[PDB]
Design a protein around this ligand. Structure first.
Ligand SMILES: CC(C)[C@H](NC(=O)[C@H](Cc1ccccc1)C[C@H](O)[C@H](Cc1ccccc1)NC(=O)OC(C)(C)C)c1ncc[nH]1
Lengths: 99, 99
């Protein structure tokens, strides 16, 4: 689909059995989601945005169906206000910015 | 143009006499630029991003040339790590997200 930006670009994603709404974010290098129950071992990481640094858990090899499209990537889980799909997965669903 | 997300979408901008590089960000409702030298009255405002909230000075009706597109809107100047072009200016130059 073609998405105009008059509203926030929100899409439904299905991750580990759960359905969530998330932001197609061109300014996020990483995908960070709010806390949830994801299986597997994870690594401790820290990331920064406006306002500073948050501590997150990284999970590699996770599968996500974005606005119905499958992709597998590193998903960082931890204290974010909104769920963010960043460039590591956006390039997997063939997303482009057009103007 | 058509920008693929394999690298950060940086575009050259012209804001008040000066040349800067900024990120095209669909996860940002506002345009936030790093501490610059802008003419005028500005008003305080606080914004939240993933690691917290920052105090920025707000500017309205500021002209910006984003890639040869002149657009006019509110520009927030403050302590951001990178200059961000958010949806309030992205819609003016006709920028869409596509997949
Ligand atoms: C991993 C993501 C979260 C992170 N990116 C962001 O936080 C980017 C900005 C940035 C890019 C590069 C370096 C620093 C900051 C911002 C996102 O677009 C965020 C996503 C979000 C939406 C709504 C509420 C809270 C957060 N937007 C945001 O911070 O809002 C403003 C208006 C201040 C830009 C990032 N990308 C690269 C390094 N860190």
């Amino acid at each position: 689909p073609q998405i105009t930006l008059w509203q926030r670009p929100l899409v439904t994603i299905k991750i580990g059995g759960q359905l969530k709404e998330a932001l197609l974010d061109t300014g996020a290098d990483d995908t960070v989601l709010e806390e949830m129950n994801l299986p597997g071992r994870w690594k401790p990481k820290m990331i920064g945005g406006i306002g500073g640094f948050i501590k997150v858990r990284q999970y590699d090899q996770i599968l996500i169906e974005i606005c119905g499209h499958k992709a597998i990537g590193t998903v960082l889980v931890g204290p974010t206000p909104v769920n963010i799909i960043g460039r590591n997965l956006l390039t997997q669903i063939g997303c482009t910015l057009n103007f």
